[PDB]
Amino acid sequence: HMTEYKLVVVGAGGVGKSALTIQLIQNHFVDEYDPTIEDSYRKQVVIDGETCLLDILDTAGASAMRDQYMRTGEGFLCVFAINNTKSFEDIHHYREQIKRVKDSEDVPMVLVGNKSDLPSRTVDTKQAQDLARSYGIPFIETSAKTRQGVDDAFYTLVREIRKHKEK
Numbered sequence: 539h540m541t542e543y544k545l546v547v548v549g550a551g552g553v554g555k556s557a558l559t560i561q562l563i564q565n566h567f568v569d570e571y572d573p574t575i576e577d578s579y580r581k582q583v584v585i586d587g588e589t590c591l592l593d594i595l596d597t598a599g600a601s602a603m604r605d606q607y608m609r610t611g612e613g614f615l616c617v618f619a620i621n622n623t624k625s626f627e628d629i630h631h632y633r634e635q636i637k638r639v640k641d642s643e644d645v646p647m648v649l650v651g652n653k654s655d656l657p658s659r660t661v662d663t664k665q666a667q668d669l670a671r672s673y674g675i676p677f678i679e680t681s682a683k684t685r686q687g688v689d690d691a692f693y694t695l696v697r698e699i700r701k702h703k704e705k
């Protein structure tokens with residue numbers, strides 16, 4: 539009685555992959571979550587009248603688990619932090635890896651700019667928009683601290699997966 543959606547959260551160390559994921563599952567902000575825990579979580583959530591069981595891999599480091607989620611994951615959150623220019627620059631590499639594993643430029647994906655609550659961003663919203671536009675994907679700004687944008691990011695990914703394949 540539910541539809542399963544397999545999601546993978548990727549991006550540089552420190553950007554808030556775990557904090558976003560924990561926020562979605564537990565509705566709290568974690569200051570410090572072991573930066574080495576790579577694991578999968580499950581959330582049941584009704585999105586547009588469909589009961590979804592999200593199977594989410596929170597990636598960490600560099601794994602037999604990750605290989606399978608990369609091959610069989612249906613959508614990707616590609617996360618950078620708006621105060622980490624290098625994490626933004628790194629997106630290209632995460633997107634390239636995903637394209638290669640899928641042999642496709644048409645993979646459900648959302649670009650996520652995290653830590654929107656922090657002052658004096660170094661990556662402007664227009665830089666991120668430019669990048670998401672060239673990739674043909676949505677850009678969503680989040681804060682795992684305030685929860686701004688968190689459900690938006692995950693719901694939008696679910697919708698991008700549907701736009702791409704029957705579920």
Ligand SMILES: Nc1nc2c(ncn2[C@@H]2O[C@H](COP(=O)(O)OP(=O)(O)O)[C@@H](O)[C@H]2O)c(=O)[nH]1
Binds near residue numbers: 556569
């Ligand atoms: N202020 C703020 N800090 C955050 C946010 N997201 C994560 N952090 C902090 O940034 C650090 C890295 O977060 P983490 O979730 O471990 O990153 P990961 O390596 O990508 O899983 C931790 O100290 C978090 O508390 C956010 O949206 N706002």
Ligand SMILES: [Mg+2]
Binds near residue numbers: 556
């Ligand atoms: Mg982590």
